[PDB]
Amino acid sequence: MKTLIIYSSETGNTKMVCEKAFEYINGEKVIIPIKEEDSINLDEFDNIVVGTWIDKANANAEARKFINTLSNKKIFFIGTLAASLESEHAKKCFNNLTKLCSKKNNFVDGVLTRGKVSKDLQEKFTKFPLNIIHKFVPNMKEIILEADCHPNESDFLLIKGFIDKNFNY
Ligand code: HEM
Ligand SMILES: Cc1cc2nc3c(=O)[nH]c(=O)nc-3n(C[C@H](O)[C@H](O)[C@H](O)COP(=O)(O)O)c2cc1C
């Protein structure tokens, strides 16, 4: 059995948790960024685990496009987002990723972990249009601040549980 972990990451959060997933998996496995897809033959992999960061409650474009090149693959996701993992927003994100993976592939499971908001985006949040767009989103300031320390051990434990559940202990 061969497992591929293939990910998008701009500021490293998704890469970080996907690297933990790679470490925890036993047996044959490869981890690459999506940009290096040509380094492997997708046909050789029984499990495809896609790492994605949340962009407006959905998979980031690079990861969305990659998933939409796949058909009938046994597929999983590992997502990062800045919202609280207990929030309704996170549940909406999880459902959106489930819908994306299940549409044309064979979706088994996924996990969301938390990741800090980039310095650049934290600055843009104080400017038009993001400040107006999120004006009435509750707890906006604290959500961003409480994401700053993530990913951290709490997220790695979520990854460990996800790998335990789906691949091996
Ligand atoms: C460039 C970055 C972002 C953009 C362009 C963006 C865009 C939007 C837009 C347009 C909406 C209104 C709903 C819609 O029309 O789709 C929205 C709502 C919301 N955004 Fe963002 N957002 C960004 C970053 C973030 C981040 C970093 C967080 C969390 C830390 C966040 C959390 C939310 C929440 C909780 C809502 C309320 C609606 C919901 O629960 O989905 N957003 N955002
Ligand atoms: C353009 C953009 C849109 C984002 N939209 C959301 C969002 O809708 N919900 C959320 O919780 N986090 C959102 N975030 C925060 C990222 O999902 C989070 O910081 C992620 O861990 C970054 O991953 P990376 O470091 O692998 O690039 C957004 C970030 C960016 C840059």
Numbering used by the authors: 1 to 169
Q: Any passages from the paper?
A:
We discovered that HmuF and a paralog, FldH, bind tightly to both FMN and heme. In contrast to flavodoxins, FldH and HmuF do not stabilize the FMN semiquinone but instead cycle between the FMN oxidized and hydroquinone states. We show that heme-loaded HmuF and heme-loaded FldH traffic heme to HmuW for degradation of the protoporphyrin ring. Both FldH and HmuF then catalyze multiple reductions of anaerobilin through hydride transfer from the FMN hydroquinone.
However, brown crystals of heme-bound FldH were obtained. The crystal structure was solved to a resolution of 1.6 Å. All of the 169 residues of FldH are present in the structure along with the heme and FMN cofactors. A notable feature of the structure is the helical cap domain (Lys116-His150) that bisects β5 and ⍺8 of the flavodoxin motif. This helical cap, comprising ⍺5, ⍺6, and ⍺7, provides a cleft for heme to be positioned planar to the si-face of the FMN isoalloxazine ring. The heme iron is coordinated on the proximal side by Nε of His134 in ⍺6 (Fe-Nε distance of 2.2 Å) and on the distal side by a water molecule, a coordination environment that is consistent with the electronic absorption spectrum of the heme-bound protein. The side chains of Leu121, Phe125, Leu130, Ile133, Val137, and Met140 form van der Waals interactions with the proximal side of the heme, creating a hydrophobic interface. An ion pair between the propionate group of the D pyrrole ring and the side chain of Lys92 (from ⍺3) further secures the heme to the protein. The orientation of the heme results in the B pyrrole ring forming pi-pi interactions with the pyrimidine ring of FMN. This places FMN N5, the site of hydride transfer, 3 Å from C5 of the tetrapyrrole ring (i.e., at the ⍺-meso bridge).
